[PDB]
Amino acid sequence: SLFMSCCGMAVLLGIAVLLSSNRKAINLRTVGGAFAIQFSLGAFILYVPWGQELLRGFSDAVSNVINYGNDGTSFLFGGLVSGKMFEVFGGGGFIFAFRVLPTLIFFSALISVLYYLGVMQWVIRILGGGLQKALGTSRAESMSAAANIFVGQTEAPLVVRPFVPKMTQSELFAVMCGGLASIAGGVLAGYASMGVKIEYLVAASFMAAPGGLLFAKLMMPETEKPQDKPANVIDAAAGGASAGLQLALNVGAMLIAFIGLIALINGMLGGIGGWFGMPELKLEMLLGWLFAPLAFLIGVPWNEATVAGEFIGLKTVANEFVAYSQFAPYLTEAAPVVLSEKTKAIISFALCGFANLSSIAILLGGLGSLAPKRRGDIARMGVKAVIAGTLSNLMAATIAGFFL
Amino acid sequence: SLFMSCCGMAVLLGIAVLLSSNRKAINLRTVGGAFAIQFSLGAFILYVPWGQELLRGFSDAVSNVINYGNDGTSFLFGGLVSGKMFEVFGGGGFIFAFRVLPTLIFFSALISVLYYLGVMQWVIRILGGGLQKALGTSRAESMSAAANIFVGQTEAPLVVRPFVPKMTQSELFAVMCGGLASIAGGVLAGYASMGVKIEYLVAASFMAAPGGLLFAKLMMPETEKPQDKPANVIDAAAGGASAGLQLALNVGAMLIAFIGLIALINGMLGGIGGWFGMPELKLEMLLGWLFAPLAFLIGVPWNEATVAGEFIGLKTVANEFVAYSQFAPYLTEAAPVVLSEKTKAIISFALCGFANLSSIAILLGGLGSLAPKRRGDIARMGVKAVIAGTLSNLMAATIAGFFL
Amino acid sequence: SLFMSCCGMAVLLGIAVLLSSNRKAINLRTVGGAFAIQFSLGAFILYVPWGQELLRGFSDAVSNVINYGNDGTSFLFGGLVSGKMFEVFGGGGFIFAFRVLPTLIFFSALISVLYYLGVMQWVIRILGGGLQKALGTSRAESMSAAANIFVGQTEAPLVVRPFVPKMTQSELFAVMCGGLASIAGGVLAGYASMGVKIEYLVAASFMAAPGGLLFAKLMMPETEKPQDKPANVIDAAAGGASAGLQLALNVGAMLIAFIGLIALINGMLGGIGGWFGMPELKLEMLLGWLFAPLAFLIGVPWNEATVAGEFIGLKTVANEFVAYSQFAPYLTEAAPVVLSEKTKAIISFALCGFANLSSIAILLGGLGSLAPKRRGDIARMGVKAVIAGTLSNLMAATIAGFFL
Ligand SMILES: CCCCCCCCCCO[C@@H]1O[C@H](CO)[C@@H](O[C@H]2O[C@H](CO)[C@@H](O)[C@H](O)[C@H]2O)[C@H](O)[C@H]1O
Ligand SMILES: CCCCCCCCCCO[C@@H]1O[C@H](CO)[C@@H](O[C@H]2O[C@H](CO)[C@@H](O)[C@H](O)[C@H]2O)[C@H](O)[C@H]1O
Ligand SMILES: CCCCCCCCCCO[C@@H]1O[C@H](CO)[C@@H](O[C@H]2O[C@H](CO)[C@@H](O)[C@H](O)[C@H]2O)[C@H](O)[C@H]1O
Ligand SMILES: Nc1ccn([C@@H]2O[C@H](CO)[C@@H](O)[C@H]2O)c(=O)n1
Ligand SMILES: Nc1ccn([C@@H]2O[C@H](CO)[C@@H](O)[C@H]2O)c(=O)n1
Numbered sequence A, B, C: 001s002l003f004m005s006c007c008g009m010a011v012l013l014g015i016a017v018l019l020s021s022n023r024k025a026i027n028l029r030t031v032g033g034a035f036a037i038q039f040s041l042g043a044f045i046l047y048v049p050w051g052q053e054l055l056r057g058f059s060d061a062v063s064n065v066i067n068y069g070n071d072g073t074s075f076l077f078g079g080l081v082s083g084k085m086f087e088v089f090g091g092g093g094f095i096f097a098f099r100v101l102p103t104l105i106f107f108s109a110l111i112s113v114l115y116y117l118g119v120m121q122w123v124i125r126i127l128g129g130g131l132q133k134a135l136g137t138s139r140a141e142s143m144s145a146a147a148n149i150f151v152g153q154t155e156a157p158l159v160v161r162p163f164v165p166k167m168t169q170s171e172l173f174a175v176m177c178g179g180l181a182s183i184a185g186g187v188l189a190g191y192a193s194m195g196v197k198i199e200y201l202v203a204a205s206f207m208a209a210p211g212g213l214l215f216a217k218l219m220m221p222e223t224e225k226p227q228d229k230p231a232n233v234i235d236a237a238a239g240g241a242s243a244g245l246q247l248a249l250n251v252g253a254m255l256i257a258f259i260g261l262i263a264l265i266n267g268m269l270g271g272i273g274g275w276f277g278m279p280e281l282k283l284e285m286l287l288g289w290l291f292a293p294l295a296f297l298i299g300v301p302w303n304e305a306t307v308a309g310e311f312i313g314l315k316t317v318a319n320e321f322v323a324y325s326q327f328a329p330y331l332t333e334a335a336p337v338v339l340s341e342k343t344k345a346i347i348s349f350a351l352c353g354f355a356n357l358s359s360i361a362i363l364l365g366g367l368g369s370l371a372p373k374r375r376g377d378i379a380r381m382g383v384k385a386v387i388a389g390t391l392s393n394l395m396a397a398t399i400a401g402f403f404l
């Protein structure tokens, strides 16, 4: 029943302790409160009636903004994003390149506008302030954690830019983990446009802030001593649209290559596996068979662990965008395998994060440009930070599955 | 009758004098001739029979070039830009992204070719030479004004690149105004592909050269003393296509964001306005109500001033591309409001310009790269230059409405 | 019969000798073996039964990879690349921008992956090693020649990057020729997706390695004395996709401009030619009339030389991508002119190369960045290198036509 979930949380906590740089340096107030916040946050917005209402209210607001932004892409691509497409091409009428990718552009512009107005800084200051006061974490790493709820791993540390070059190894590691444990507002709307429940996306985003700090301070406790704009609103929107455009082009090119490469891998795996009497061997079977214990450990039923392992594994070995692309058909009525609603939630939560190996190179560029003499430390702690970010997503998925 | 137009011109001239840096330094020959040229140019090509024939001849030639360039986009997007699209999606068969944006690429390549051959330099030298000889303006600012008829605000000063770092504040201001009062050959073909009459676009482009110098020397008179390539034609075309591609991507991303943001603004304005008994409140109503006196002042009928104010205002607070995108449906048979032909002309002329706040940042980058130690002056005169560019477009619209 | 082909080869060899920097410095072993290899390679894979089987086996493998990569573009553009497109738009259902361009992205990612694994370096080391041992050419220029079979003119010298700044003028010229005589794996799959026979593309690619060295050492004999990575596989794929994206955008923008410009040229040529009683004058007629002797010289029948001259000429004055775009309809059942299978082969081989004037500027950037103090030599030998690359493609076409 609920025993598998509580054991799941214990195992995830245990792995982080075993991989800690110094277990005797672990601050029990910090890691105790961080888990308490992430757990209570899950209890609040997924179990308690009032918290569920606030979550649905924020989600519907997000859903309304997406529809508003869709007027922009409707102007550019016209009938190619209309209802007539489904009458002609059926299911293939949904053109991903025109339906999902342009949303990255609009939300990037919106976020840039909200930064110019000071709305974002206002929310981050409140959330980040409450974290450091309750966990004892430093000012800079707390703000970066709160910022990571809404923006990406490279944009989040920008709110504490002048503090990055001199922050401790534990601080830098937490900053990295904050970005790896979360996603971004732009891609969130993209995943929502692909069928992923917004309530799960918003929840996992907020739970990433304490969850990121949790496993960061578990695996890399503080052993040192920490310390302590566009001309107008229209320029802000333009700059945001430009950054979103570049992102949309990068994501699209990645999806063409990766999905194409996976198809190539499956073709080769069919021939190689055939030598051992398994010609039906594919990448999905390997990932599913290898991540099934992990899926089962976080609350996925025994008969659904293998399928759930495919998506979780693909997110790890590649990225969450590719995983969501393969998981999205399982959210429609034309799903090859009908999954339970709890399993759908667990997969949604466990995928909601930038935790992968390729994100290390991105951290080296974005976060590294803020502190060029610290690129060595980023590369050194890269793998451990990904593991920490993975544990945070898995913990959030276990918590979500518990109250569901 | 015509009294409202002549008063309109007087008011526009009056505002520039009131905002002048030194009214006693205003050269009457310069500002007198500049207005005389812009007025006579309007009289020539919009009223006098022969001038109307030369305008239609140049416009049809432009219209033929656009159709020739459309063979390129027809090859890439095939049936998505064919007549079958209108049979399937109806009005939504016109895909803006494939119909308008690729034209920016072709014309950028063409202009680059005409620069390599020396055709552009030949025309600019004649027009720019006649301006300085009649107005007394300096050599450099005159060529940049003439160049601005065909190319953008950042490409126009390139013909006088080595003179920019040492030109006077009045010269630099005129260069800025020349770009803000005009558009570019690429986007001109785009607006033409959206339904805007080419005759109006060409006319307003040529009237921008004396009009730009007019309000530049009115608001910033000269108080100082002025002074005084690709390997082959195929490389020129390739470089032009590359620049046009980058432009086409920027415009498209901007249109997705801005239109999407306007839709978001309208949603919020509906809720905010509802608090004051106006739930139907939108961005269009605010702009229309605030720019109606300005539209009425330049010759737009009282019962059409509010609608015309929406487009003029949107061009100012954002850019002319967004304004044209909302004005284009009013040029078809399926227009929500049937406007008079004179009103259509006034709006077309008043929108034909890069005069907006975001163009300042663009001037800081493009024009600023030509003179890095002058970026301070560009930022300082930015707002006044936009105002001057706005007055030039409004003057051209008043002149156009007069002879129509 | 076969006398026209052998004379064709002799003429091509003769031109290179006449344009040599020093005919008395020509190494007979080098240029003798290089021609022997290119000729025997053609004999092997186009005439001899076993060699034809190995060619078809490699081609079908290439054809399978393309289909695998098409799963990526099928996900992004959905029904716009499905069979329904041909039912609605007929022949115009084939959208080039979604059918061909995305293939550049996938193959660029694949090649980047094969480089990370060491597969490419392994094949290049074998082919490049056999060339230098048989021709006496230096180590660096041999590897660059072999690398050019699979990758582009700017990516090929990267395998011998630290040797480029100090290599002789003859070596540098050979490196340039190796890239101009060949194409790239990405665009190869593009041309294959346009209808060009893969067997011809693969054959011409392999024949480019000895053919490139052949005319390089003929026109520029050695008179001096020669001398002598991503964090993971997923990062390699991402970087490749990014480079392919940039390439796909450049090619698409070029095709819009160039084809559009050709349409504009044809319009002007119709008016200019009309003055001399030839209003039907077009760019195709000029190129066909001027390259017909060259087409006839390499084995194209007298009544097909003019049509074949259009494609060969267009490849020279522009690029092979534009030429292939105009030659592709001649490979379908709806061809305006039914050509013989041998003529189709000759045109396919003669077009398979980056040999054009615009590739010089590209060599100045790519190859020049590897040796900034050698950009002068690259620009100096630019034209001769293009001629050499042209002769290599023409030789390969003559050889192909001989055994066919
Ligand atoms: C489409 C899906 C198909 C399935 C593909 C699965 C392949 C698994 C990739 C793992 O490769 C490793 O990843 C590390 C992470 O980058 C690299 O470490 C590199 O970076 C580390 C830190 O960032 C350092 O510790 C190392 O020294 C450095 O080698 C390491 O070299 C590399 O072997
Ligand atoms: C989609 C449409 C929705 C409607 C939106 C309308 C909003 C109006 C924007 C105006 O904002 C101002 O614009 C100036 C122009 O850039 C800025 O001046 C900045 O730049 C000037 C000069 O370029 C300087 O004088 C100033 O010091 C400097 O603040 C200024 O800060 C900013 O407040
Ligand atoms: C769409 C198709 C329409 C048909 C168009 C056909 C036009 C033919 C273009 C030829 O122009 C020449 O090309 C050279 C090659 O770049 C240039 O040499 C330049 O570069 C050379 C070496 O790279 C140097 O030798 C020269 O000094 C230098 O002028 C040269 O200037 C230029 O006149
Ligand atoms: N705003 C964003 C969006 C995405 N990303 C990177 O792209 C991968 C796929 O979404 C993510 O996993 C992440 O590596 C990013 O760094 N910042
Ligand atoms: N050639 C061009 C075209 C456009 N622009 C800038 O983009 C805005 C929208 O067209 C314009 O208002 C202007 O700011 C530009 O600077 N140069």
Ligand SMILES: Nc1ccn([C@@H]2O[C@H](CO)[C@@H](O)[C@H]2O)c(=O)n1
Pocket: C151, C152, C153, C154, C184, C186, C187, C247, C319, C320, C321, C353, C354, C355, C356, C358, C359, C362
């Ligand atoms: N990988 C590639 C692909 C293309 N190119 C350049 O682009 C032209 C058209 O394919 C080619 O003729 C060549 O100039 C390149 O340099 N490298």
Ligand code: NA
Pocket: A147, A148, A149, A150, A151, A152, A153, A156, A178, A179, A182, A183, A184
């Ligand atoms: Na984040």
Ligand code: NA
Pocket: B147, B148, B149, B150, B151, B152, B153, B156, B178, B179, B182, B183, B184
């Ligand atoms: Na201009």
Ligand code: NA
Pocket: C147, C148, C149, C150, C151, C152, C153, C156, C178, C179, C182, C183, C184
């Ligand atoms: Na090559």
